[PDB]
């Protein structure tokens, strides 16, 4: 019906302002993040999400900066941003971004409502693309600081997963301190609950750990209404941290209920693939530097089936691009290439 | 059913174990707070709640220690405790025989919310007051609950009595000593907690209490959010941005790092027929500055609670109001001249 038309700056690429018209402007969601719209680009008829948020004239926008720095097959792409005008006499920043139909959250709640669970394949596929996105933003030393099921968008038909909502990501700098009160309750890592401030990008690795667990498990692995509740669940599985391990998370704790390290194998449903639990235990480690790196985790047995050249989706379609590893991603440790890129994908 | 006979040490009193015999052990609930059963005492036929938790010898049970010091109309009474071996083999459980109370403020408030109804201010008034007595009392011992939330406020719908409960997070707060910043349920955390400060004080509880107040008026949590950021926003939306002092006064070293949202007026927040009184009290508990917050006793003496100091105040069900005025010195320790307000003309003669 009514068609809107703006002048916007393209996301990556040089300020060459463009006319952008769109229509069919359903609200998707809204809250802390901002307000998110579905929208249909006039031209192509393509669907896009638009994230309208408040802009402080004082500062430049942190998410925006990041987003423009970022181009990756598993991260929603900013396409245009642009300013505009709920709250009169003040200015809105609008990110026009890829739109994706489902979210890992929705999807796993669907399976859970139905007491069933996710074909393991569909997990691997997702977990892997997630580790790719982490591997890649981490190579700018950027940290999402909010990996949760709700922030992982799925294309159900193509199985493409895209990491999204960077309203929270920050480029971590060594010896600079950052707020410990980020990240979503359940996916907070030990050191965060222990209120640390010198945490590294490896908190993303812990969150992903809980995402994997939660998909394997039907339900969040470290639930808790309070920090303590969570710690107990974490302890009940890892076992009591040690003085050594606690110095690792947060020194200023060098205040503890003495429990034995419960065998992982008894935490997961019975026919849970062994390789998967192996993965988990190497992601969810008390010691931040002991956890796998995103890239080390991509290159792990649990993902071995993704490298089989025969691998297809249940709907018999092809798996998305899995091995097109820009030098950038590989940057954190390039010898891993040999594994990440299976013989059959180095063929002429 | 089965009858069970342990030998148990009385909660207060001397330290003299005795045979205690109970039966009918339905299982109220269980989470981090260990298990909580319910059961009927053979002697009094009375109902109790047993809280069974795991015990190390590697330390005295902090909760037990506290419970034994506590006698108030508005705090669950520890009646006995005793040890046993239960679910874990060669593992040792401490059991806490405690007053059983039929309802919780969570449960009630939900009914009302579902129903789209809103809890009659008389009840918000009674519950809140009683809450505030129980804090006043515990804080006089410099004990701090550290987990004030509707789930942990029990009620007897009938007698209208609120009793504060669950003390596994309660710790006595000593000055210049540090305490873990990861106590308190999601929605009810004081800002300084969200900033991981460890220099916090009993006030964390007054914030958690003003949260319960707000909820009972609003009909839902006042500062919701699945992350510390989301809540901190929610709060800023209401209290405006912290000054730099306000900030240095919670956690000192978050001086750097904030959106400059103006304060959306307190009035502007509540349904329009909300008693001014209520909001005024709210604004006084939900302060950034820990020191600027009302004290529990200071709060009972607030104009909001005036309806209760009336002589012909009576419950909706027609019964009269519970012990509101049995203040002991102890309780009033923080500020005695309040007594002339807290205790009205008619009470206690």
UniProtKB/Swiss-Prot annotation, chain A:
ATP binds at residues 28-36, 51. Expressed in testis, thymus, prostate and ovary and weakly expressed in lung, brain and kidney. Colocalizes with EIF2AK2/PKR and TAU in the Alzheimer disease (AD) brain. Keywords: ADP-ribosylation, Alzheimer disease, ATP-binding, Biological rhythms, Carbohydrate metabolism, Cell membrane, Cytoplasm, Developmental protein, Diabetes mellitus, Differentiation, Glycogen metabolism, Kinase, Lipoprotein, Membrane, Neurogenesis, Nucleotide-binding, Nucleus, Palmitate, Phosphoprotein, Serine/threonine-protein kinase, Signal transduction inhibitor, Transferase, Wnt signaling pathway. The active site is at 146 (proton acceptor). Its EC number is 2.7.11.26, 2.7.11.1. Residues 22-303 form the Protein kinase domain. Activated by phosphorylation at Tyr-181. Inhibited by lithium. It is found in: Cytoplasm; Nucleus; Cell membrane. Phosphorylated by AKT1 and ILK1. Upon insulin-mediated signaling, the activated PKB/AKT1 protein kinase phosphorylates and deactivates GSK3B, resulting in the dephosphorylation and activation of GYS1. Activated by phosphorylation at Tyr-181. Phosphorylated in a circadian manner in the hippocampus. Mono-ADP-ribosylation by PARP10 negatively regulates kinase activity. One of its GO terms (cellular component) is glutamatergic synapse. Monomer. Interacts with ARRB2, DISC1 and ZBED3. Interacts with CABYR, MMP2, MUC1, NIN and PRUNE1. Interacts with AXIN1; the interaction mediates hyperphosphorylation of CTNNB1 leading to its ubiquitination and destruction. Interacts with and phosphorylates SNAI1. Interacts with DNM1L (via a C-terminal domain). Found in a complex composed of MACF1, APC, AXIN1, CTNNB1 and GSK3B. Interacts with SGK3. Interacts with DAB2IP (via C2 domain); the interaction stimulates GSK3B kinase activation. Interacts (via C2 domain) with PPP2CA. Interacts with the CLOCK-BMAL1 heterodimer. Constitutively active protein kinase that acts as a negative regulator in the hormonal control of glucose homeostasis, Wnt signaling and regulation of transcription factors and microtubules, by phosphorylating and inactivating glycogen synthase (GYS1 or GYS2), EIF2B, CTNNB1/beta-catenin, APC, AXIN1, DPYSL2/CRMP2, JUN, NFATC1/NFATC, MAPT/TAU and MACF1. Requires primed phosphorylation of the majority of its substrates. In skeletal muscle, contributes to insulin regulation of glycogen synthesis by phosphorylating and inhibiting GYS1 activity and hence glycogen synthesis. This is Glycogen synthase kinase-3 beta. The lineage of its organism: Eukaryota, Metazoa, Chordata, Craniata, Vertebrata. The chain holds residues 35 to 385 of 420 of the full protein.
